[PDB]
Amino acid sequence: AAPLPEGVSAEAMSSALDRFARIVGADWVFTEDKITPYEDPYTISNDETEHRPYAAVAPASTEEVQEIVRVANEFGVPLWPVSRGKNFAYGGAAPVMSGTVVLDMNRMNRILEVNEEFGYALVEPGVSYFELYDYIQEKGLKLWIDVPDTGWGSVVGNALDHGIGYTPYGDHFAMQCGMEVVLPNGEVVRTGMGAMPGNNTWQLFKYGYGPYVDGIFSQSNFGVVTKMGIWLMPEPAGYRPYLITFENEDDIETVTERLRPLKVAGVIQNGATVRSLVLDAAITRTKSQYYDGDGPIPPSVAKTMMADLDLGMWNFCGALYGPPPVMDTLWTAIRDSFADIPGVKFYFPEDRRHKVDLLLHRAETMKGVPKLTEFNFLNWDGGGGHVGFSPVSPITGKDAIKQYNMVSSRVREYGFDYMGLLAIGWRDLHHVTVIVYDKTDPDERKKLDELFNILVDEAAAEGYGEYRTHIRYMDRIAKTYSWNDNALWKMHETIKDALDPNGILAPGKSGIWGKNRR
Amino acid sequence: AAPLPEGVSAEAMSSALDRFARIVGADWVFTEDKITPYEDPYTISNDETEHRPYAAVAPASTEEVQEIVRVANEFGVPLWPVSRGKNFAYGGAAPVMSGTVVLDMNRMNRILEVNEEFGYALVEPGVSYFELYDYIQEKGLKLWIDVPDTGWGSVVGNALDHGIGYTPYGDHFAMQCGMEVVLPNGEVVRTGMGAMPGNNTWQLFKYGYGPYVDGIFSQSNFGVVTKMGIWLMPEPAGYRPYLITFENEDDIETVTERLRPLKVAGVIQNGATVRSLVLDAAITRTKSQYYDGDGPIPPSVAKTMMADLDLGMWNFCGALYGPPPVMDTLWTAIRDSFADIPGVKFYFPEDRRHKVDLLLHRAETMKGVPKLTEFNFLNWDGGGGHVGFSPVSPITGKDAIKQYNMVSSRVREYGFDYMGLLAIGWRDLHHVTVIVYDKTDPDERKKLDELFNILVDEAAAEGYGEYRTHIRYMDRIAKTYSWNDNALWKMHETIKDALDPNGILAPGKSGIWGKNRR
Ligand SMILES: Cc1cc2nc3c(=O)[nH]c(=O)nc-3n(C[C@H](O)[C@H](O)[C@H](O)COP(=O)(O)OP(=O)(O)OC[C@H]3O[C@@H](n4cnc5c(N)ncnc54)[C@H](O)[C@@H]3O)c2cc1C
Ligand SMILES: Cc1cc2nc3c(=O)[nH]c(=O)nc-3n(C[C@H](O)[C@H](O)[C@H](O)COP(=O)(O)OP(=O)(O)OC[C@H]3O[C@@H](n4cnc5c(N)ncnc54)[C@H](O)[C@@H]3O)c2cc1C
């Protein structure tokens, strides 16, 4: 069902696939029926010709990657690199442009080094959070990792896409240090201290000397990353996870105001996440257990869910790290910041009367333990796919309540339950909207797509721009960053054409196309 | 005395200078006698044709910068951008290539915003640490800045060169967020959230969307930065600076071993700096006050200096930040790490019996107060210039003692006093050598240059590479990063040729030349 990419003959694509099998072995080129796991699991498009991978190649080594790229250049065949291809909600493993060949690097799954005394790992793209965690536990190394939830994905791939987690080390790409890259011309480079032969500092110091370029290979089609370093947090002297609940939907305004100073100054040591009722309820319950109506849940049902589950309309999870005197002092500051809000409640794990419970689950994540759960937002409405919209805004009550109002209104009018959170990294607020939908139903897919377009449009007019998005929306989000007639993308295109003149790496990633396709 | 740059006619250079004065006004083009402050203050070269600026232009605004660059392209005339041009020990304001016109941006000195609730500033390149500090004190804003010592320089220029300071915010470029850049083609771009019109998040979130490119404009000739954001630390709830001295030169091995875990885990909240006797003595004394010999100081004199000044052979300055219970807990951990070393002593300010004193001075710096001092290493030998060599290494005793041994041996054999420190950022050790010399004396200049070359060569063979260097050595340091036949510089050159095909921005910065001069 997948078309050849525009400009590429069937002869060309056939020679390429052939030379690919000479490079990796015939068993490691997939076509035809074996392509289905490279499809987006959470379909949005109703046009079945969109975002369709033609083929996949799975190399064993950096140098194989290089040969493939050289062949790609030779026949004009475009590649879409994935590390493990678990980018669910963002298109999974699927390309922007139909007919692109997937460059699957899952087989390159070596943990090249884990260093306990300097707190780092050097990993290939195939390495999962589960495998890294399991390695560390197995060797008994006193290190924590930082994981998404749910905890599927590549350490490399998630970091390159600017992914996040729930410890002090939650900004994954900020913790990156050193990479090896195959450039679009097939040359291989190492960044930072890795460009110096005989260094023992690749993972100890980011910059090296000269222009700092690691960042240009994140959210990018400027090269293929084959090795990447990441800093790992030493196991702390203590760990106390907490949940603060708030009774009223309006509380999120004053909560955000109080969060701002604690986060700017670092009194809260990890990202602060304040989740709406449904998002946290969906960890241990489904909709049909509280309401049989087709549409979003009414208020009386909300109050029932709150009483059963000991949750609020807003649910703030964070954690304390370090020696008990430190944790005690920080807690005093945090708790005092919220004590005077009517209806507030404060919980540590021992205060949770349920044995299967939101805090108990999130406590795992904020300690860097990768988990899958039986229930999460995906099962709230008995199944479906999801998409997320997570634009950046200032940490103010005004911005938080305005986004909650704007988004919840539209989401509910479209027939979806509102599932949103307010996330704070350091100085950055994100109102994150999660929309679960029936990806098998074309009428729902249309509604979802339309809702998504409108949410982005209306958010952008208030000055809130997206930092990470699905393959289907990459062009749209790029057009948000339109200052001076798209001057920044004009520079990205200049760099693209110099590094990749034949435009063979992931055409359209981050809205970057290349001279032959612009 | 300054030659035209190679390839540029006298006609061409004359038209350019003319059009420059049409752009900025005739009063803001300097030539002839007014060029002398653009010379390197600490001459190394004995060839007086090297590193000589032909002229200087001082624009008032971004858009003037753009016009200049467009004219530079038109006549083939190369520019060397400076923010304030206080890069002393690195060449001052002077270019790598003689005949380059200095683009002096000192007049662009607006503090565009200082935001107390979100802890940031947006500054133009002319803004000094002194001016930023003075602004904040004047408005009574509860923010600290992070300053070099001595505290001259541009907030922008120092950060772009990967400069450092002495608070938790000591990695200046890591604290950068958002910039405006004039590209070598004269187009203007804003990075991150600044590329979205109507954002209020330029200084709140680094990435924006897509490839992260801010880094490529650091230590670079890829564009001219005209505005830059930087995060500022909220004033903490307490501040306790300390000095730990060690009696024996050999102690630095075990000291580095003990520093490693404290720094990796962040128990020490700022950079750790362990300075040799002379470097700290030179803050309050000169050589001739303790020894009249021409050569380096003997051991008996060292012991005299230690007893007078309450200093050791090694002197560790750091500081505690936050609420007293936190500072108390961290101090316990730090002090216990070193208590068992024979001859160790521990001081807070009230324990220093001298009123003019190393700890009292460094206490200012580790609180982000910019200062000049009457005495520092520059006056140790009655005057001269300086150069520094600060390569990266792992935080081990073995690496520290090996570098101390290697460097002190050669430095002393050349007739200089050893002045060195062990600096730790987070995971990175730097043995920093400071060499003070008589920049007026050509025999000393020759010795210094030779010593410098040899120190770099021998360090690099042990796997220790430099991250920041003088204009004279930029090509040399680039050749350190030589893996895969200089593959990283080959990529930098690809980017240079695409962004700057006429090679008019700072030819030779970081060893990056451009097609017309390679
Ligand atoms: C229920 C749910 C919860 C989620 N929770 C989180 C969360 O808490 N935090 C979070 O950050 N994300 C979260 N996500 C998003 C996503 O699932 C994770 O971020 C996941 O870790 C990303 O997949 P990956 O690691 O395999 O990346 P990949 O799919 O391997 O890579 C992502 C993209 O990066 C680029 N890329 C990858 N590898 C390379 C390479 N080697 N060289 C060049 N470019 C490359 C490509 O553009 C690729 O499409 C969630 C998703 C869902 C569905
Ligand atoms: C005694 C002594 C002590 C020192 N102590 C320290 C210290 O503690 N910490 C430290 O970090 N340094 C230190 N230094 C080095 C130096 O003095 C400082 O780093 C100083 O702040 C740098 O000068 P500047 O800020 O004006 O940078 P500039 O000279 O303005 O800029 C430096 C370089 O960056 C580039 N550049 C600058 N601005 C731009 C722009 N807008 N766009 C593009 N490229 C640009 C150019 O390559 C330029 O040559 C010390 C030096 C001496 C002599």
Numbering used by the authors:
A (entry chain A), B (entry chain A): 2 to 519
Reproduce passages from the article:
Enzymes of the vanillyl alcohol oxidase/p-cresol methyl hydroxylase (VAO/PCMH) superfamily are found across all kingdoms where they perform a range of metabolic functions. These flavoproteins share a conserved FAD-binding domain and a more variable substrate-binding domain that enables interactions with a range of substrates. One of these, the 4-phenol oxidases/dehydrogenases, catalyzes the oxidation of para-substituted phenolic compounds.
The P151G mutation was found to elicit the same oxidase-activating effect of P151L whereas P151T and P151N conserve the properties of a dehydrogenase. Conversely, in the dehydrogenase variants (P151N and P151T), like in the wild-type structure, the loop obstructs the access to the N5 atom. Conversely, no tunnels are present in the wild type and the dehydrogenase mutants where the flavin re face remains fully shielded by residue 151 and Trp153.
